[PDB]
């Protein structure tokens, strides 16, 4: 009946928001990542790290506001508030990108805390921990994109910036510089996200249209009882329907719901792997056979060669303003351009 | 010396065969372009 | 096209080895019931 046990007791009380041991890591770190993002997006600039305005204070709106990455000259500095860069000065710390590392690192530990919460509550309730396991996919994406990708690069500067339009820019960077759409690990991710959305829609619709008539009313929601033993829709009719429409159907509810976990989790896991490749500029940029043919045969043209011209435009047109530390000066005559435009 | 009591039968039903072959054929269809390069 | 010559063997094996494994496990499953 020692103190440790007493604290266990209190941490694990049934209350409106459950706390747990995992709450000790989760709640401070989640609140701080979130508050860092709302503090930076409301008040903090990117002028000294990026040459950009990035807060409401400066005149940006919800789409263009961001907490931007540190300057490329910071390398992979932790940018601790008390570290040699900011030297304890809150203001300079803000101006040098300190909130980017604050959010990313506190976010990381929050994510850990959230997955520990899923483990903690699942043990207390007596259920299998498959919701935690599933959550490994979000974690994999976050670390691969926000931590591993820039750690392979020259600096944190090239990580995603925490904002709507900043992420849109991150998408387009990856097209032009990594040709990320060509990457089979991204493709497997696309199939998992779209495959998952499909499953989500097709499963919800099937249940809602194979319902048993368990009440007299035209709103069919009233006629379910959470403790009823009986299935609330017909697997049998569902299976015959899809078998006749599509050719195959699920017959095993368990496999069906496991598949629904499996598809989107795996897709996200595959894309993480590919972004790890891109940390090293290890791209699926080209198909060698196409380039050798197209170098020799100026009549040979595919959608693959067409898209590289686009990547080439992107790089040359966005690079000077997107990488201000490189002092790229591209005079007019060197910019790639088609006729007239 | 006894026969080892830990031995267990292995199963793969027909549906798992179809699912698994589809996986492998679609994987092959996706990566082969990159293997030929 | 000047394509990687090993692509073929790689693709063939990538298909054959995992498929043969699944077939082996299915047919012996069926010989039980």
């Amino acid at each position: 009946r020692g103190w440790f046990d007493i604290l266990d007791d209190w941490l694990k009380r049934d209350r409106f928001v459950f706390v747990g041991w995992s709450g000790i890591l989760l709640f401070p770190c989640a609140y701080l990542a979130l508050g860092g993002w709302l503090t930076g997006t409301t008040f903090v600039t990117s002028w000294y790290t990026h040459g950009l305005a990035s807060s409401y204070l400066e005149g940006c709106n919800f789409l263009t506001v961001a907490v931007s990455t540190p300057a490329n000259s910071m390398g992979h500095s932790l940018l601790l508030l008390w570290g040699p860069e900011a030297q304890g000065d809150f203001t300079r710390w803000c101006q040098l990108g300190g909130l980017w590392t604050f959010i990313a690192l506190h976010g990381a530990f929050g994510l850990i805390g959230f997955m520990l919460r899923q483990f903690e509550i699942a043990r207390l309730v007596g259920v299998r921990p498959y919701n935690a396991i599933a959550f490994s996919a979000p974690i994999a994406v976050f670390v691969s994109v926000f931590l591993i990708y820039p750690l392979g690069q020259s600096s944190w500067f090239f990580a995603p910036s925490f904002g709507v339009a900043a992420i849109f820019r991150f998408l387009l960077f990856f097209q032009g510089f990594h040709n990320w759409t060509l990457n089979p690990f991204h493709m497997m991710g696309v199939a998992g996200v779209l495959g998952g959305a499909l499953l989500c829609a097709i499963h919800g619709a099937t249940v809602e249209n194979t319902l048993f008539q368990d009440g007299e009313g035209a709103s069919t929601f009233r006629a379910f009882n959470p403790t009823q033993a009986e299935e609330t829709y017909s697997m049998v009719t569902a299976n015959r329907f899809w078998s006749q429409i599509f050719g195959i159907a699920f017959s095993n509810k368990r496999w069906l719901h496991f598949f629904m976990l499996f598809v989107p989790v795996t897709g996200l896991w595959m894309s993480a792997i590919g972004v790890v490749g891109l940390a090293l500029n290890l791209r699926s940029y080209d198909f060698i056979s196409q380039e050798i043919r197209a170098a020799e045969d100026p009549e040979f043209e595919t959608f693959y060669t067409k898209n590289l011209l686009l990547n080439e435009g992107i790089r040359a047109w966005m690079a000077p303003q997107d990488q201000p530390h490189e002092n790229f000066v591209f005079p007019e005559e060197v910019l790639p351009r088609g006729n007239a435009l | 010396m006894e026969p080892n009591p830990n031995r267990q039968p292995v199963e793969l039903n027909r549906t798992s065969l179809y699912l698994g072959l589809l996986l492998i054929l679609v994987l092959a269809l996706l990566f082969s372009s990159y293997f030929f390069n | 096209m000047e394509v990687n010559q090993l692509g073929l063997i790689a693709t063939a094996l990538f298909v054959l080895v995992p498929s043969v494994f699944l077939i082996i496990l299915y047919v012996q499953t069926e010989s039980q019931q």
């Binding site: 049998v236 299976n239 078998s243 050719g247 195959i248 159907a249 017959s251 | 039903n13 027909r14 549906t15 179809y18 072959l21 589809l22 054929l25 679609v26 092959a28 269809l29 082969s32 372009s33 030929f36 | 096209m1 394509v3 692509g7 073929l8 693709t11 063939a12 298909v15």
Partner: peptide
């Protein structure tokens, strides 16, 4: 040879479809 390979794999998938549908394990009640 690359063309033969791509079409072969696609052809196998199409045959697999045939068996998955018409030679499925038939679902059986309770």
């Amino acid at each position: 040879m690359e063309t033969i390979t791509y079409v072969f794999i696609f052809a196998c998938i199409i045959a697999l479809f045939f068996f998955a549908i018409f030679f499925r394990e038939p679902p059986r009640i309770t």
